[PDB]
Amino acid sequence: MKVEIDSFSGAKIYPGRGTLFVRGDSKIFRFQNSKSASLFKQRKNPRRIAWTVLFRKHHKKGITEEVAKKRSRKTVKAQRPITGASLDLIKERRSLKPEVRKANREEKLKANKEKKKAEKAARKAE
């Protein structure tokens, strides 16, 4: 079995207890009680009716539901390899990064290479 919710009061409708209504547009309403039913037929607004759950929740009364959204104070904690880099050697080369004389000497080599490049290019142009 199941329990349901009055359209008007928003109340548990234990089985059998209460009425049901089926408008021509196929909207199925349920009513715990003829009180709610009669108000509905009067075309009242539960948000204006005071004892109703809609008014309750629209005026923010009994607000023990929500508390807050949690936040984690840390990082993802994965400086992992990219599946083709061998993380051990990856960290080894990351540590070799400081004391950058290796890359500096490669730059100096390609630098004298650019020197000789302009030189030999001018030579061929001559």
Partner: protein, 171 residues
């Protein structure tokens, strides 16, 4: 019922055909993002805790976030939203869904684990699927490894070896 559970760090996933109707009555009347007890559903899941991610009910209509009901509804959905892909730019569309409350109407419930309990799970924790792709961007690789601003991502590159015939290559 079925529990399509996932462990996102291991990247693993498995369906579990559940009974113990009352140990899923616990799951009844539950929203998305909420976390209930593995032990409460199953001592095989003792100590674990999941998070109700969502699920498909009968007629395959998924659970959508934010609507706050168990019953099905027809929403005039639009782009940038679950449960509808547009086959044209500008197309809004009316589709039927089920909402963000849990009940017997559901058939498959999609769960994600946030904590690993005391025991181990056969198809989730004992296994771990790898990262199918490596980062294709320079700085993403560089920060993923923690190298420097200048540590030559070009040579820290990923190389994924595959053989066409006997000729093999990393592409």
């Amino acid at each position: 019922m079925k529990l399509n559970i996932s462990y996102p760090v291991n990247g693993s996933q498995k369906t579990f055909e559940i009974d113990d109707e009352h140990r899923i009555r616990v799951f009844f009347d539950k929203r998305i993002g909420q976390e209930v007890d593995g032990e409460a559903v199953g001592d095989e899941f003792k100590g674990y805790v999941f998070k109700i991610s969502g699920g498909n009910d009968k007629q395959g209509f998924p659970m959508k976030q934010g609507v706050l009901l168990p019953t099905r509804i027809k929403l005039l959905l639009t782009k940038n939203v679950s449960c509808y892909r547009p086959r044209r730019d500008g197309e809004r569309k009316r589709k039927s869904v089920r909402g963000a409350i849990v009940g017997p109407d559901l058939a498959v419930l999609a769960l994600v684990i946030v904590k690993k309990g005391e025991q181990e799970l056969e198809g989730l924790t004992d296994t771990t699927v790898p990262k199918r792709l490596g980062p294709k961007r320079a700085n993403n690789i560089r920060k993923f490894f923690g190298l420097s601003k200048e540590d030559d991502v070009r040579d820290f590159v990923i190389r994924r070896e595959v053989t066409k015939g006997e000729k093999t290559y990393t592409k």
